[PDB]
Design a protein around this ligand. Structure first.
Ligand SMILES: Nc1nc2c(c(=O)[nH]1)N[C@H]1C(S)=C(S)[C@@H](COP(=O)(O)OP(=O)(O)OC[C@H]3O[C@@H](n4cnc5c(=O)[nH]c(N)nc54)[C@H](O)[C@@H]3O)O[C@H]1N2
Ligand SMILES: Nc1nc2c(c(=O)[nH]1)N[C@H]1C(S)=C(S)[C@@H](COP(=O)(O)OP(=O)(O)OC[C@H]3O[C@@H](n4cnc5c(=O)[nH]c(N)nc54)[C@H](O)[C@@H]3O)O[C@H]1N2
Ligand code: SF4
Ligand SMILES: [Mo+6]
Length: 791
């Protein structure tokens, strides 16, 4: 009857604040900053604050709903309650018919950086090892794919080599389009402490519009969309021009390559920009001489930079001067500005160069730090490998040796994991539209609302009668309402969980409460489904002839209830500890999966701690080796994978050196023209998360920001007969929405640029956006398209 408090990471942004959750009488009634979490040390943003309301939204789903018409499934039918048994019958039949008629390629899953590590792992096994389809792709394809491809190109291993502790040791902070004041508030406040308490510290904030992070900027810069590539190249030039190359670091630790150019925009091949492409979608590169490079960036003159970006010459020099100064510990930060960008991989590589020329990396207070938006985009989506090309621990389906390790460990026949790359996020949109993808299960995502260009591909595809759409969600979203089967899902602290944040910190949480009705977690869903299939129904005969001891076995027995996954008995759980899945299946399912999964990366640079260690700690940052977590990767002393006297080893590349890539500016896919005269950028707002399905179900979050507005410059409204408060129609070549004029909000765009958040389900901004992606990462450029306003 006293409140019970236990740790969990925050359900929201990638900062990964530690939280103490208070339960009483089967409800979460209180939630506070965990004092002893090193991330936030008790601090909290308004979203973390309202965590106890997110589960008690008004219309939680409690029951599977199928579209039905006199007693049977119908695409045009009315959502009607059916049992779990019946929901799996229909799913069983749908998957089994697709496998029969077009095979594994006609079946797909759309997963999430909001999945629990084990949910991600289970899903991958189901799809890759069970059904033999790589058509599993996440959330995170809209988000971190560009930073990930960037890491792989520059370092050969994923994820940052610094940590949040760099904040209170930095001399200078450069945010490359990150609105950290709103999207990483706990980081911001820590930066704010650093800045405000120390006069020799500088803060540069570059953005496409003025926002709340400008408040703390010594060097506040507004540039033109895409022009960051110019600035990035310019600073590199400046460093050379000013003899600021750290020679010693440069000599032992860097290679130079030139990247392939004129790569298109990851649109349908029929599209003008694809036909016009020279090297469409190529990530190819060749070794490059130093003077080749020096000539390359010499094109990027202070004068040209100023023109191409609209930013004052002296401000560009103040900025490049921070990188060049040999005594300035610098942190570089970026988020979707760099990542949701048609040359975002290039962006990523381009910013690394800056750090790599100057030797500013893998040291306390000093490093390039790719921020992550989602709570477990890193720990789940990226580390487990819930992508179409992926296997655990940075491994690729494309590599026969990688396939071998996984097939051997999982104890499935040789050759069962498929070698062909599956369909990425936007490609799944395109395949659905085409009737090529006929069975499609979405989990822990709101893609009808979050994915780009709704009208053109996704809505017609989802609604196509050749297709069967399944969504698992705690709430009836835009996505759920567009589906054919809705599966009611356990959320956050209604299950045992694990999330991995932006600084490689893995954080566990015990189950504290129980889901309403018959809501089950994604882990239950996936694992109970696996029992509906026999090996002979998913694997070809001559795969079975390699291990005939698996004939007549279900994907359940084969992927989840193996002696290995089930080593761990329920007696290991505390007597009064909730764990619906494990208590049902009679073994500690989360740990067995975790311990089989951790195996891949242990001893290969990705080391996860013993399962049970995370249940004690307020998280651990990997590699965790002999009890000891890693704060800085790739530097001697800090990382146990660097030998004595090496100084720096980037052991992700065969030869241990990081790679600088010379890459040009290329223009955004769609810029303003005569008709569509304004830039449109999109993103978030402090008080809302993503599509708002959770935060809008919080009375007071809704009351702080009830509707999406359109942030517009006074004179752009003036010139259009639009006044603050006016109803306004925003129109692109792809669709339209009706919003409200805001000339005096927190975001003040320069003239010519309009900005709009996507949380509001009545104002679907992704009816406007262009599904052009970085052709290398396949990440959609949500930040940049052309638009017009009518009254
Ligand atoms: N309150 C809140 N916080 C969140 C979330 C949320 O929903 N709500 N979601 C989380 C997730 S998953 C994500 S991915 C993040 C996103 O976090 P951010 O990327 O920080 O925020 P957004 O609102 O998505 O991005 C708008 C920013 O894009 C920049 N931008 C636009 N065009 C360009 C360009 O050409 N170049 C560059 N360099 N920058 C550009 C603008 O400067 C602006 O700063 O937020 C995370 N945290
Ligand atoms: N225009 C535009 N579009 C964008 C972006 C942008 O800046 N501009 N940002 C992109 C980025 S960075 C991201 S990360 C994506 C995010 O896009 P999404 O991840 O699709 O959006 P969310 O609202 O996070 O979706 C999470 C869903 O899961 C439900 N849910 C909560 N807990 C659980 C659970 O345990 N299980 C299940 N099954 N469901 C659960 C919530 O109700 C919610 O419907 O959006 C991308 N789309
Ligand atoms: S900063 Fe992020 S992790 Fe911390 S409380 Fe806010 S939303 Fe949650
Ligand atoms: Mo994101």
């Amino acid at each position: 009857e006293a409140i019970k408090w236990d740790k969990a990471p925050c359900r929201f942004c990638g900062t990964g604040c530690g939280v103490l959750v208070g339960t009483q009488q089967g409800r979460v009634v209180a939630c506070q900053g965990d004092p002893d979490a090193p991330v936030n040390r008790g601090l909290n943003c308004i979203k973390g604050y309202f965590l106890p309301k997110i589960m008690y939204g008004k219309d939680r789903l409690t029951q599977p709903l199928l579209r039905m018409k006199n007693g049977k499934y119908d695409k045009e039918g009315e959502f009607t309650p059916i049992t779990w048994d019946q929901a799996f019958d229909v799913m069983e039949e749908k998957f089994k018919t697709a496998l029969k008629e077009k095979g594994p390629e006609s079946i797909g899953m759309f997963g999430s950086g909001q999945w629990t590590i084990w949910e991600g792992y289970a899903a991958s096994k189901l799809f890759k090892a069970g059904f033999r389809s790589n058509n599993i792709d996440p959330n995170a394809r809209h988000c971190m794919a560009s930073a990930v491809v960037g890491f792989m190109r520059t370092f050969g291993m994923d994820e940052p080599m610094g940590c949040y502790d760099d904040i209170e040791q930095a001399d200078a902070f450069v945010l490359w389009g990150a609105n950290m004041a709103e999207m990483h508030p706990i980081l911001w406040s820590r930066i704010t402490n650093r800045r405000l308490s120390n006069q020799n510290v500088t803060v540069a904030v570059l953005s496409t519009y003025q926002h709340r992070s400008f408040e703390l900027a010594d060097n506040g810069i507004i540039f033109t969309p895409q022009s960051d590539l110019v600035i990035l190249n310019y600073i590199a030039n400046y460093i050379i021009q000013n003899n600021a190359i750290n020679q010693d670091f440069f000599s032992k630790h860097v290679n130079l390559r030139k990247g392939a150019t004129d790569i298109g925009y990851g649109l349908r091949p029929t599209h003008p920009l694809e036909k016009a492409a020279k090297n469409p979608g190529s990530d190819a590169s060749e070794p490059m001489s130093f003077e080749d490079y020096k000539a390359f960036v010499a094109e990027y003159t202070l004068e040209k930079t100023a023109e191409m970006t609209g930013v004052p010459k002296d401000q560009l020099e103040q900025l490049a001067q921070l990188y060049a100064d040999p005594n300035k510990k610098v942190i570089s930060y970026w988020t979707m500005g760099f990542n949701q960008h048609t040359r975002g991989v290039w962006a990523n590589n381009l910013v690394y160069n800056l750090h790599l020329l100057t030797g500013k990396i893998s040291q306390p207070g000093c490093g390039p730090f790719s921020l992550t938006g989602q709570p477990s985009a890193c720990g789940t989506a990226r580390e487990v490998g819930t992508f179409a090309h992926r296997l655990p621990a940075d491994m690729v389906v494309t590599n026969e040796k990688h396939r071998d390790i996984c097939e051997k460990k999982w104890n499935i026949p040789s050759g069962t994991i498929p070698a062909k790359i599956g369909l990425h996020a936007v490609a799944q949109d395109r395949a659905l539209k085409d009737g090529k993808l006929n069975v499609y299960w979405t989990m822990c995502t709101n893609n009808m609302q979050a994915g780009p260009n709704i009208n053109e591909e996704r809505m017609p595809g989802w609604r196509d009668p050749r297709n069967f759409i399944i969504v698992s969600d705690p709430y009836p979203t835009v996505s759920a309402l567009a589906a054919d089967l809705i599966l009611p899902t356990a959320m956050w602290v209604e299950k045992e969980g694990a999330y991995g944040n932006a600084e490689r910190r893995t954080q566990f949480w015990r189950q504290q409460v129980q889901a309403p009705g018959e809501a089950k977690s994604d882990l239950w869903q996936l694992v109970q489904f696996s029992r509906r299939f026999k090996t002979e129904e998913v694997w070809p005969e001559d795969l079975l002839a390699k291990k005939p001891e698996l004939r007549g076995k279900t994907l359940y027995e084969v992927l989840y209830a193996t002696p290995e996954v089930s080593k761990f008995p329920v007696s290991e759980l505390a007597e009064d500890q909730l764990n619906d899945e494990s208590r049902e299946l009679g073994f500690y399912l989360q740990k067995g999966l975790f311990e089989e999964y951790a195996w891949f990366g242990r001893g290969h640079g990705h080391d996860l701690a013993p399962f049970d260690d995370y249940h004690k700690a307020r998280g651990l940052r990997w590699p965790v080796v002999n009890g000891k977590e890693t704060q800085w990767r790739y530097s001697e002393g800090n990382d146990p994978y660097v030998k004595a006297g090496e100084g720096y080893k980037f052991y992700g590349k065969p030869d241990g050196k990081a790679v600088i890539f010379a890459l040009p500016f290329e223009p955004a896919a769609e810029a303003p023209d005569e008709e569509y005269d304004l830039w449109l950028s999109t993103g978030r707002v402090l008080e809302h998360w993503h599509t708002g399905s959770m935060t809008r179900r919080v009375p007071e979050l809704h009351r702080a920001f009830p509707e999406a507005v359109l942030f517009i410059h006074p004179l752009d409204a003036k010139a259009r007969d639009l006044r603050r408060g006016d109803k306004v129609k925003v129109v692109s070549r792809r669709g339209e929405v009706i919003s409200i004029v805001e000339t005096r909000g927190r975001n003040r765009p320069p003239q010519g640029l309009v900005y709009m958040p996507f949380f509001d389900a009545a104002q679907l901004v992704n009816k406007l956006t262009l599904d052009a992606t970085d052709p290398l990462s396949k990440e959609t450029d949500f930040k940049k398209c052309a638009v017009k306003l009518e009254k």
